[PDB]
Each structure stands twice: as C-alpha cells, then as structure tokens.
UniProtKB/Swiss-Prot annotation, chains A, B, C, D, E, F, G:
Fe(2+) Fe1 binds at residues 18, 51, 54, 127. Signal peptide: none annotated. It catalyses: 4 Fe(2+) + O2 + 4 H(+) = 4 Fe(3+) + 2 H2O; Fe(2+)(in) = Fe(2+)(out). The gene is bfrB. Changing residue 148 to L: About 70% active in Fe(2+) oxidation and storage, diiron-binding site does not coordinate fully, decreased overall flexibility of the BFR, loss of 1 ligand to K(+), reveals more Fe cations bound inside the BFR cavity. Fe(2+) Fe2 binds at residues 51, 94, 127, 130. Disruption phenotype: No growth phenotype in iron-sufficient conditions, cells do not store detectable iron under any conditions tested, cells secrete less pyoverdin siderophore and deplete iron from the medium slowly. Very low amounts of FtnA-only BFR complexes accumulate in vivo at low O(2) levels. GO terms for molecular function: ferric iron binding; ferroxidase activity; heme binding; iron ion binding; iron ion sequestering activity. This is Bacterioferritin BfrB. SUPFAM superfamilies: Ferritin-like. The unstable catalytic diiron-binding site within each subunit (Fe1 and Fe2, ferroxidase center) also serves as a pore for iron uptake; the ferroxidase center is labile. In the iron-loaded BRF crystal structure additional stably-bound iron ions are seen inside close to the ferroxidase pore. Mutagenesis of residues reveals other stably bound Fe cations in the interior of the BFR shell; they may represent a pathway followed by Fe(3+) to the central iron storage core. K(+) binds at residues 148, 151.
Length: 156, 156, 156, 156, 156, 156, 156
C-alpha cells in the first residue's frame, strides 16, 4: 500500500536510531560481562534485544508502505569506557531518539497515517521506560555510592 | 525526565478527581453492604479498586516527569442517602471526570506528550465504561421498578 | 444497632488517622520505587494496603452503629524528601495514631462497647508492629550506614 | 479451679439466655421450612447451632470453675406467627442477651477473671453479628417489599 | 395436612421426653469430660445429638400435621453425681420414654396415622438400643469393677 | 518503643515464673520417661515446650519495649519424688503463676498497654488449661486408683 | 544402673554449662532479631536449640545412672551490648565449656565409663564446631568491616 514519502523517511530515521542503539547496547552488555558485572550485562543485553524488536516492526511497516528500509547507514555509537559513562551514553542516545519519535508522530498525524502513529507511540513508550531505568541507575550511583552500586551488579 | 509543567498540573487535577471517586465509591459500597444489598456493594467496591489503579498510574507518571503528586487536596464527596441518589451521585462525578480528561488530552497532544495522552485515553475508556454501567442501572430501575431492582442486588 | 455517640466520634478520629497514613505510605512507596529502592517501595505499599484494611473495618463498624463515616476530612500528610526523613515521618504519624487508639479504647471500655474495643486493640497491635519495623529501619541505618542500608533495599 | 461465685451466677444467666435462643431459633427454622422458605429455614438452623456452641463453652467453663451448670430453667420463648414477627422476636431476644453479656463482662473484669471475660467477649461478638443480620433483614423487607423478600428466601 | 388432635398431643409428649434427654445427656457428657473420662464424655455427647435428631423429626411431623410444637415445657432432668448414678439416671429416663412411645403407637394405629406410627417405631428402636448400651455398662461395672471400668473410659 | 517501667518489671516477673516451669516440667518429663511412664513423660515435655513459647513472646515484648529481659534469676524448682507429688508440685507452681499474671494484667490496663495485656491474657488462658489438666489427673488417681492411673500412662 | 558418683558430678557440671549457654544464646538471638539482624538471630536461635539437645542427653544419662540432674543452679550469663561483644561473650563461654568437657572425659576414661565418655566427646565436637563459627565471624568483621558484616546479617 503506497505510503507517504515523508512518513517513510521518518520511519527510516527512527530505524537508524534503533540500529545505533542495538549495537551500542550489545557492546556495553559484553563489556559489563567481561568486567564481571553480570547483572548489568544481562539487563543491557535485554535492552539490545528490545531495540531489535522495534527495528523489526519498523522494517515491516516500511516494506508494507512500499519503501526501502535503510539498514546501511549506521550513525555514531556512543561507547562509554566505565559504568557511569556507559549509562550516560545510553541516556544521551535515548533523549535523541525520543525527540525524533515525537517529530515523526506529528507528521503521521498530519497526513492521517494513524497506524504508523500508533506503532511509533508504542516505541516511544518503550523508550521512555528505558529513560526511567537509566535515570534511576544514575540516581542509585549517587545514593548508594559507586562501589556499592557495582557490587550489587556483580551477580545475576 | 523533565515533563511539561502544565501536563503535570493536568495529571494532578485528574489524580484529584480519582481520589474523590475512590472514597465516594468505597463509602457507597459499604453502605450497600450494611443494607444487605451485597451485589451492589461488591460492584461498587470493584469500582473503587479500579479508580485506585488509575490513581497509581497517574502518581507514577507524575514522579517520572519530576513532578510532585498531590494526594493532600481532597475535593467534595457526593454521597447519596438511597440507592437512586448514590448511583446519580456517581454519575455526576464521572461526567466531571471525563470533561477534565478530554481537556488534559488536548494539552498533552499540543506539547507532544504522547505517552501521557495514551495513559489518559486508557483512563477515559474506563470512565466511559463506568458511565455506561451507571446509566444502565438508572434505566433498569425505571424498567423493572425499584423494589425488583433492589431485590436483584441482595445476593452476590 | 444504635452506638454511643462518643464511640462513633472516636472511630471517625481513628479512621481519619488511617486515611492520612494510606496516602502518606502510598506516596512514599511510589517515591521509593521511582528512586530504584524497590524493597522499600514494596514494603511501604503493603503498609498502605494494611491501613486500608483497618479503615474498611472502621467504616463497617461505624455504619453498623448507625453513624456516618467521615472520609471527607483528610489531615496533613507528612511527606519526607529522602529515605531517613520519610521513615521518621511515618514514625511520627504512627505515634499519634497509637495515642488516639489508646484514648478510644478507654472510652469504649467506659461505655461497655467491648466489641469496638476488640477491633481497636487489633488495629493497635498492627500499628505497634509498624512502629517496630520503623524503629528497626532507623536503627539499621545507624548500624550499617546509610549507603549500605539503601543498597540492601534496591532489589526486592 | 474454684471460681468466683458471682461469676458462675453470671455464666449461668448467660447460659439460660442461650438455651432460650437455641429452642426459639430451632422452632423458627422448622416453621420457615414447613412454609417453603428454605433459605430462612437454613440460616435460622445455623443460628440455633451457633447458640449451641456458645452454651457448650459456658457449660464447660462453669464445670472447670467448680459450679453447677443449670440446664433446667428454661425462660420464655418468643415465637412469632409470620416472618416479620419471627425476625423481630429474635431481635428482641438478642438485645436482652447483649445487655446481660455486658453486665457479666463488667463483673468478670472487676474480680480479675480475665479468661471468663474473653469467652463472654467472643460470645458478644457473635450476638452482635446476629443483631446485624436481623436488622438487615427487617430493613430489606422495607426496601424490597415483603413479597419479594419472601420470594428471595424460598430457595437455598 | 390436618392431623388427629390426640396424635399431636402424643407427639408433643414424646418431644418433651426427648428435650429432657438432650439436656441430661449433654450435661452428663460435659461432666465426664471435666473428670477426664473422655470416652464416656464422647459417647454421651453422641447420645445427646441422636436425641436432637429425633426431636427434629417430631417437630417437623407436628408442623406438617398443623399442630404447634411445644419446646417451652422442660421436665425434670435426672442428674447424677458419679458415673454409676449418671448411667442409672439415663436408664430411668429411657424406660419412661419407651412406655410413652408404646402408648403413642397404640393411638396412631387406632386412628390410622400409619406414618406417625412408623416414625415413633424408628425412635423406639433407637431408645431400645440406648437401653441396651446402658444395661451393658452397668453390667460391666459389676464384671470388671468400678476402677477398671472408669480406667477403660479415660481415653477415647 | 519506650514501655512503662513497671510493665517491664511485671513482664520480667512473669518470665521468671515461666523459666522455673520450663525446667521443672522438663525434669519431671525425663523422670517419668526414666520410670517407663512414657505417656506422662511426653505430655510433660509438651508442657515444657509450651512454656518456652510463652517465655519467647515475653522476651520479644520486653525488648520491643526497650527493657532488659532477665534470664539470669532462676527461682525455686518444685521437684516431686513420685507421680502424685510431681503433679501437685506442677499445680502449686501454676497457681502462683496465675496470681502474678492477674496482677500484671491490672497494671497493663492502667497504663493503657493493651497489647501487653492481650499477650498476658493469652498466656493466662494457657496456664488455666494446664491447671485443668493437673486437677483432672489428680482426680483420676482418686477415681481409678494409683496403680491403674500409672498403668494407663506407661504407653504413649 | 548405679553410676560413679564423680562421673555424675562431672555430668551435672557440664549440664550447668549448657544451661548458661542455652539462655545466653537465646537472649542474644532475640536481641539480634529486635535490631533487624535476622540472619544472626536465626543462627543464634539454632545454637540455643542445639545446646538444649545436649542438655537433654545429659539429664537422661544422669537419671539412667541414678543421679539427680541439677537444673536449679544457673551460672553467670555473659551478655554483650553489641554484635562484636556478643560474639566474644559466646566464645568466652565455649572455651570454658571445652575445658570442663576435657576434664570430664579424663575421669570417665579412668573409671571405665566409656558410654559417658562417648556422649561427652559428641558434645565436645559440637562445641568445637561452635568455636569455629565464632572465630570465623570475628575474623569476617575484620576482613569485610563491621558495617558490611552487619549488612550481610540483616536478611535471612
């Protein structure tokens, strides 16, 4: 079913953001596992897989709308080098992602693509849940101290 | 995540309406039970619990958006003295609640807080279901007569 | 069954104290959850629910005694800004609650309302259990240190 | 164990009241069954059995305290001729029973027979539950009408 | 169904005998339990319950026959002071009960109330079984001696 | 929670009585077992354990009330030399225990420590049950003879 | 079976040591529970119960040997005011207990009471296991720090 050109462009922009996140979260997960921080490693693995699920739905919607999913352009991964930096890098990425989701929803509404809007709203709910997790972890580091925070994430 | 100040004000206004409804429905429930109208008592108890679930979601959303949930201001409970009046009191409250929900959704849409809009839409769906129940009960009183209607609500 | 007017006034006073505690504990629970201190959040949620159960029994007793339960007057919530303050706010509220329960029991005994006395004694047992919990938590903060205490309350 | 002579007199007075109620409730139950009001008949049967359980506990306590249980004196049964009268006769008896229970509790407290007091308090709780039931039924007759009330008590 | 007036008088006389036995056996049971003769206590409790079942059937029959069951007149309880006396008191009562049952059966036969006769015959069979039990216990006291007889009735 | 000094003194006095009883009953149990009176030995062991449970509750209450439990002062054990004397020694101790419980309940009532009163009432119920057991055993020795009484307590 | 008088005296000395330990461990358990150090409380409770089992075996052996078990003399309880002191008080007591056990075993061997020796050796093995536990806990306080050690003993 032929979709709106600018809707497809927005969906590809969102997809691009998801693809950055998949790789950033996967690498952060394996860094945490290598360091023995297995609870963080496991949680971050699940974040990567969740982003994969959103990317899948976007690819499927773009193809239904007769557009070309762009999996070729990979933007800048924000790779941290210690736990605090990695969490902040994930948060910086998620805040860019939600800005782009809101702009995409505005356009879907304007052109009456209510099904694409609903998909993007579901993704936005997941991304806000991730922001909640990240803000909470950064706050816990302050409240319990970094050494205790890391200790609590050694064991699954 | 820093929310829109006016969104947070709207969410607190909705929360205030829920808090009235929780208490009004709980008292109505226990009045019906005291009178031996246990089917009405049980249904009204479930209505109170459902309002508690909505209030919980509003409180959680307000905190996520870095606002202060207001559980201190309790507005006017509309307490009936007999079954007909109690149902009409619940209906009067629900109609004010839906007006406020619609106004809050307008504002969430305007500032692109699509997740808050979706939460409020889910609450609005529940409130419209309650309106349907109340209108139906008031109509049944007219069709079957008050004595039969009360008889049908003695036993669970 | 027509109850003693002063007993009913005392039961409404107790009920008012419970209604403050329900809302104060519910808000504290959701604050702790927002901060990632989920063990505190869960325990405080259960404290709120327990207070709801006491309020229910008081409402039921008042109605049986042919009085009017007052769910309209909500007194001052004592909301802390950090864990130490929130626990102390809960403790300050519980100490006022037990003072009022003891005075109400004295009056029930004087007028031979032994069943209302038994209800209040059961509520008082629950409130003293909550005092024990609160004093214990405040003591643990001193014994293990604040950072360790909070660490031990991150995971349920 | 040698009990207080006046305590034993009070326990025998309570026992006498229970023995009236056992027989009154049993006869009312069988009258309702004969008329085909089987739900009333079953509930009233259970009321008779509950009074039997209280009488047993009183007989047991009297014997432990080295007194003579009096099962010989049977006071006046209050037998109605229709459902409304039967319910009111039960209520009239229950209100005499609670007056005597409260006076017995006062005396037990004054002579430090705290175990006898606790037994009497439990019986008083059961008698107040019966009062609630009876007041509720009389109220339902007014709210739903006699014909509907009786209809609702034909089948168990 | 309108019964014979004299049949109903006979049924009320039998019922009166049963009501004596219920209370006499119940008191004897609780006396034996107080003394630690729990096997006698349990057996005598079951005798009381069985008499209650006969009384129920008599009450039900009287009401079907459009008479008024008399639960108000309680005759003389025969209460013993030791095991031998208590068994003999029960036997003395049962022998009066069977005389009255036989006279009632004669009258039922004469007026062709064959269903009332059959009820009374079933009650008479139960009362003769009780006579057998009582005569047997009294004989055992002679054969094994009182101390052994009581020893054998300590434990259930 | 800071308790009343005299309440704590009373609870420590009760505790002291329990500690005597624990040891007296345990020794009596093991004497009966050594003599092959295993039913008495087992029953008396269970009495010792039940007293331990009461002592635990008193210790816990004293600590909650910010007092010092006294497990150091052990009063005079009343040890019999044969079954009759041992049972009477237990009864002599239980009668002093109930006097102290009643006096402690009075004081708890007067300072409004209704939760401590309820604990003591529960202990008093257990002590009166023990008195019933002991009086019953002494009476059975009279009724069945000492040799039969002991015979009946050889096998569990 | 007539035992050696000095063996019996040694067994009563051991028994006296056990009786101190039972009470000291029980009080320490309940102190740790009141402070919210429930893992220490539970472990120390089990230490008290285990000492009770040893005391029982000593009492049984003394009676078999035709001696009089002494449960009347209670020696000095060593009660700490904080966790470090309580552990050291338990250790001080256990070291005295093992000294007395060794002297008792010597005498049992000298008079050929090999069964009493075997009982005492089993008790000694249990006491050395307790010493191992206590020395280990005191070492852990040094290795992990007091605050972490207490944190690790909050939850069971």
């Amino acid at each position: 079913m032929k979709g709106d050109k600018k809707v497809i462009q927005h969906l590809n922009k969102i997809l691009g953001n998801e693809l950055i996140a998949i790789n950033q979260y996967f690498l952060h997960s394996r860094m945490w596992n290598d360091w023995g921080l297995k609870r963080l490693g496991a949680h971050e693995y699940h974040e990567s897989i969740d982003e994969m699920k959103h990317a899948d739905k976007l690819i499927e919607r773009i193809l239904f709308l007769e557009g070309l999913p762009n999996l070729q352009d990979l933007g800048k991964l924000l790779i941290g080098e210690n736990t605090q930096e990695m969490l902040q890098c994930d948060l910086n990425l998620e805040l860019k992602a939600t800005k782009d989701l809101r702009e995409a929803i505005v356009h879907c509404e304007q052109v009456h693509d209510y099904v694409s809007r609903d998909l993007l709203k579901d993704i936005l709910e997941s991304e806000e849940e991730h922001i909640d997790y990240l803000e909470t972890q950064l706050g816990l580091i302050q409240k319990v101290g970094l050494e205790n925070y890391l200790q609590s994430h050694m064991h699954e």
